[PDB]
């Protein structure tokens, strides 16, 4: 009913506040920022999902644009706090709306080493292996036969 009761409940962190926190971050994005900021991609917008821990889980395909390795880099988070701000972050500063670098038309979401190595191993064909020369109907049957 008042601010004091809500503050006490938040401090106690009862089972009735976690769903409220999940609801308020249903579609409320935040801003992730790298410590040295070089270009527009130094600050991006992202929809947060709650995780139990003390660290910020980041998408692998954007850290490359962030030039942020995972050897102990620390990044900052900011809140829009305003309807105009939330709409702008969802419309302009969102990661999906920034896939081409402002410098060159090359896509800044180029895949990194792990995914490309996996795909290269998946596509690098040999001369002789299990099932060489058979016939498959569709990709689903191929995946079934492989798994």
């Amino acid at each position: 009913t008042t601010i004091k009761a809500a503050k006490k409940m938040v401090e106690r962190e009862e089972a009735v506040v976690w769903d409220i926190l999940d609801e308020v971050i249903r579609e409320h994005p935040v801003l992730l920022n790298r410590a040295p900021t070089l270009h527009r991609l130094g600050i991006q917008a992202f929809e947060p999902v709650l995780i139990e821990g003390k660290a910020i889980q980041l998408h692998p395909l954007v850290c490359a644009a962030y030039n942020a390795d995972f050897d102990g880099d620390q990044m900052a988070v900011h809140v829009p706090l305003t309807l105009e701000a939330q709409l702008e972050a969802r419309a302009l500063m969102m990661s999906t709306n920034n896939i081409l670098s402002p410098a060159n038309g090359e896509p800044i979401i180029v895949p990194s080493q792990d995914v490309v190595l996996g795909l290269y191993y998946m596509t690098r064909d040999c001369v002789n292996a299990k099932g060489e020369g058979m016939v498959l109907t569709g990709p689903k049957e191929a995946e079934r036969l492989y798994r």
């Binding site: 139990e52 058979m134 079934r144």
Partner: protein, 321 residues
């Protein structure tokens, strides 16, 4: 608590009526992975069904043949046959014929209709036929197998006899065509993470995807029945049998939180076991030397604080020593 959690599904999407997306929430931190893996390994191979297993063309006796009357090679014919699903009754093996000519393409509806079998998709195109002068016929034998039989075991079964030069098709007795399970994080009021499972499956349409899920679950339950607690609870019966004398009495007096002084004083009277001391009123203590205030207080504290007291009348002692 030794009491696990049971999931409650909240989404069974039946898009396209032949590809299902089921959810499961919530599970524990590691049950989703193992459940998805087991269900996938079951539905891939160990899932009984029916599919084409033998094919014989009346004019072609080899997988490689420049066959006229059709604009497709024999490989495409075998592929379309493998892609043809059919459900058969208790008869675990049945042949059918495809005696048909014409102008357009022969489909699954042109198969000789028999009450012993049932085609799932009559409109499923089989083979494009030449518009004129093309009277081709082929027989197809289906059986009730266990799962996928690749071209290796297939060519082995060929190597068995192959007396006529019988053609062959890749047998896929598993009714499901593809399946993929994915685990994600689900949150309870204060639980860290739980395995929310999402299974996207797609079958040959011969059975419902939820029906195949239920069948795989039942087959795994039947497999595990051998060791399901031997019962529901295996112990709906409790029985409390207790003698009058307590087992603490048989233990020595040295296990009662007593100092070395009190231990030596109690051993001075040759009272080793506790039962030899509970049957002795304190009148026989202050008369014993080296039993003053500290020793007596410590004894009366560390002896009667455990529920019993000092000095009682019993006869069942010592059983059995």
């Amino acid at each position: 608590v030794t009491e696990f959690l049971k999931p409650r599904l909240v989404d069974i999407e039946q898009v396209s009526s032949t590809h299902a997306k089921v959810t499961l929430e919530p599970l524990e931190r590691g049950f989703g992975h193992t459940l998805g893996n087991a269900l996938r390994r079951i539905l891939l191979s160990s899932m009984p069904g029916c599919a084409v297993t033998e094919v014989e063309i009346d004019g072609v006796l080899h997988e490689y043949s420049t066959k006229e009357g059709v604009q497709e090679d024999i490989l495409e014919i075998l592929l379309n046959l493998k892609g043809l699903a059919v459900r058969v009754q208790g008869k675990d093996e049945v042949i059918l014929t495809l005696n048909k000519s014409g102008i357009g393409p022969v489909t699954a509806a042109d198969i000789t209709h028999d009450g012993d079998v049932e085609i799932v998709k009559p409109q499923h195109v089989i083979c494009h036929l030449t518009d004129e002068n093309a009277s081709i016929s082929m027989r197809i034998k289906v059986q009730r197998g266990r799962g996928y039989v690749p071209a290796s075991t297939r060519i082995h079964s060929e190597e068995d006899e192959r007396p006529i030069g019988r053609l062959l098709v890749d047998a896929c007795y598993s009714p499901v065509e593809r399946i993929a399970y994915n685990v994600e994080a689900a949150r309870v009021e204060q639980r860290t993470d739980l395995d929310k499972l999402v299974i996207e499956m797609e079958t040959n349409g011969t059975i419902d995807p939820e029906e195949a899920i239920r069948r795989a679950a039942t087959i795994l339950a039947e497999q595990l029945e051998a060791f399901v607690d031997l019962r529901d609870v295996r112990q709906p019966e409790v029985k409390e049998e207790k003698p009058e004398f307590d087992p603490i009495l048989l233990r020595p007096v040295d296990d009662l939180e007593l100092t070395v002084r009190s231990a030596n004083c109690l051993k001075a009277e040759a009272i080793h076991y506790i039962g030899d001391l509970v049957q002795r009123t304190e009148v026989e203590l202050l008369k014993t030397p080296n039993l003053g205030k500290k020793s007596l207080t410590e004894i009366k504290d560390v002896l009667a604080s455990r529920g019993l007291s000092l000095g009682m009348r019993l006869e069942n002692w010592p059983p059995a020593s």
